[PDB]
């Protein structure tokens, strides 16, 4: 949204992505598909994968320190 409670005059700096409760980017998951009932086991249970990506970054600082990457 641009947001309707910010204060009511048109001030055009407001970035709609940096102003969204939820809209678009998950909210219309429910259109032009039914996410087949346990399709989510392979769509959404890649939570482990994105938690691994955070682990990998948190590792990678340390290996660069002991190896002297620069």
């Amino acid at each position: 949204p641009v947001i309707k409670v910010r204060e009511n005059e048109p001030f055009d700096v407001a970035l709609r992505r940096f102003k969204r409760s939820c809209e678009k980017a998950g909210v219309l998951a429910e259109v032009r598909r039914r996410e087949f009932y346990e399709k989510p086991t392979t769509e959404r249970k890649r939570a482990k994968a994105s938690a691994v990506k955070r682990h990998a970054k948190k590792l990678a600082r340390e290996n660069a320190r002991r190896t002297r990457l620069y």
Partner: protein, 128 residues
Amino acid sequence: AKAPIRARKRVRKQVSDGVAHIHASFNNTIVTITDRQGNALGWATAGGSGFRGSRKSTPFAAQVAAERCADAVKEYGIKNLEVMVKGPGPGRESTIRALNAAGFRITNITDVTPIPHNGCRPPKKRRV
């Protein structure tokens, strides 16, 4: 001799303030002006503003629908607006920007988009 100025025959109804609704979707965007008490005062659309093809779902086409519509309500002497925004299309914010640049004052940009509480089954489109 005479070569004309006035844009249309003299004004009708005359309500001073209104609500606009922009139904923005993936294929087309519709801009419809109403009264506070629920009455269409006029509309225009991207497809009716002579785009067609892939151009029909573009922020630039959305803008030109809004300015066309703004002409149709000049007969109602409107000056102030509130706007309802409706759907996941492009043109969704870009239509608003054209309304403020039309010289209209916009009171709220209330996004309304209709969301099932889990509700009815969507079609399953793009299939394998």
